[PDB]
Nucleic acid binder design. Structure first.
Ligand SMILES: [Zn+2]
Ligand SMILES: [Zn+2]
Ligand SMILES: [Zn+2]
Ligand SMILES: [Zn+2]
Lengths: 88, 70
DNA sequence: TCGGCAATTGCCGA
DNA sequence: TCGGCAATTGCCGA
């Protein structure tokens, strides 16, 4: 894993890669926060949890209405188009 | 320096690390993405940033179809 | 384009 | 909680 939670790294112990929390964090009871590589910022793993859920809903919904896969802005393969400040 | 992109890592050359797509790739206009060491698949310099982006557009579309926060 | 070494890391064991 | 070495990875430089 290149993901190991702000806790774990500190303690220097082996971060348990699950969402919305790595094993120790849980037990030890705490908030599981990942330091985002690029942006460098904190990211509670759960925040991603839910945010992931939200696509989920969104995908049922928008699919129901007769839709699927969307054009974006930040992006995934070396084959999408790139970002530009403000504009799409 | 915390994480250098697909293109630079393979080019083996210094990556200015900028959000959301480092200048080197910006300049040239080649999409700038990160790369999953485990899978080898292309993957965005920033997951939450990608998600937050994704839902937005999902939302806007949903709005033009009448809906919401479902 | 890349050899190859600096610097980071994950995380073991104490 | 750390020393601390293994893996990993940034990136000079030619
Ligand atoms: Zn952890
Ligand atoms: Zn954690
Ligand atoms: Zn780059
Ligand atoms: Zn780039």
């Amino acid at each position: 894993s290149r993901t190991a939670c702000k806790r774990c790294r500190l303690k220097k112990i082996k971060c348990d890669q699950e969402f919305p929390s790595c094993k120790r964090c849980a037990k030890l009871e705490v908030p599981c926060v990942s330091l985002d590589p690029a942006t460098g910022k904190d990211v509670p793993r759960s925040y991603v949890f839910f945010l992931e859920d939200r696509l989920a809903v969104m995908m049922r919904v928008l699919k129901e209405y007769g839709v699927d896969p969307t054009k974006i802005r930040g992006n995934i393969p070396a084959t999408s188009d790139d970002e530009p400040f403000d504009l799409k | 320096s915390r994480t250098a992109c697909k293109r630079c890592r393979l080019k083996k050359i210094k990556c200015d690390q900028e959000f959301p797509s480092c200048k080197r790739c910006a300049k040239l206009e080649v999409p700038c993405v990160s790369l999953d060491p485990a899978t080898g698949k292309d993957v965005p310099r920033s997951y939450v940033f990608f998600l937050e982006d994704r839902l937005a557009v999902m939302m806007r579309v949903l709005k033009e179809y009448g809906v919401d926060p479902t």
